[PDB]
Amino acid sequence: EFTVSTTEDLQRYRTECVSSLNIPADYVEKFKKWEFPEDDTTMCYIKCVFNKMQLFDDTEGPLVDNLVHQLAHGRDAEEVRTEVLKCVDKNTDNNACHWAFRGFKCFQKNNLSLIKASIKKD
């Protein structure tokens, strides 16, 4: 089942991906600041994190229902879906790392932020 990711999920996934991909220390510092070079190391890191957040599958590609759940904060879901779908394409160069990262870049361009604050009516 799909659950939305928080900052703490992201921190755990970063740690796991850094370990499993043997990411160099200097990349880790950038990643902690949410700064992402457009190189293979970084693109495969983004795929790894999106995999773990169930936002991207290496065969099916971007996972739209899950992305909408992650992005919408329970509001304007059909509008969010419209925006997400603009960012969905096929694996045109047969590199799942590039595929995932292309999605991410399109999210950034369209102001679709996967990790946002939430105000709770207490």
Author numbering: 2 to 123
Quote what the paper states about this structure:
Ae. aegypti OBP22 (AeOBP22) is a member of the OBP family of proteins that has been directly implicated in regulating these feeding behaviors. AeOBP22 is unusual in that it is expressed in multiple chemosensory tissues, including in the antenna, the proboscis of the females, the thoracic spiracles, in the male reproductive glands where it is transferred to the females during mating, and in the salivary glands. The monomeric forms of AeOBP22 are similar to other classical OBPs which consist of six α-helices stabilized by three disulfide bridges surrounding a hydrophobic pocket. Our results provide evidence that fatty acids are likely natural ligands for AeOBP22 and that the binding of long-chain fatty acids (C15-C20) is enhanced by a conformational change in the C-terminal tail that is critical to generate a high affinity binding site.
Other compounds can produce the same magnitude of NMR chemical shift changes, notably geraniol, citronellol and benzaldehyde. However, this only occurred at high ligand concentrations (typically> 1 mM) and binding is weak as exemplified by the concentration dependence of the chemical shift changes. Initial crystals formed in the P3121 space group, and the structure was solved using single wavelength anomalous dispersion (SAD) of a tantalum bromide (Ta6Br12) soaked crystal refined at 2.6 Å resolution. A native data set collected on the same crystal was refined at a resolution of 1.9 Å to an R/RFree of 18.3/20.1%. In this crystal form the protein forms a domain swapped dimer, with residues 116–122 of one molecule forming an anti-parallel β-sheet with residues 37–41 in a symmetry related molecule. For AeOBP22 the predicted molecular weights from multiple measurements of the R2/R1 ratios in both apo and fatty acid bound states were in the range 14.1–15.2 KDa, in agreement with the expected molecular weight of 14.3 KDa, indicating that the protein exists as monomers in the absence of other binding partners. We saw no evidence of any significant dimerization over long periods even at the high concentrations used for NMR chemical shift assignments (600–700 μM). Therefore, we conclude that the domain swapped dimers are an artifact of the crystallization process, and further discussions below are confined to the structures of the monomeric forms.
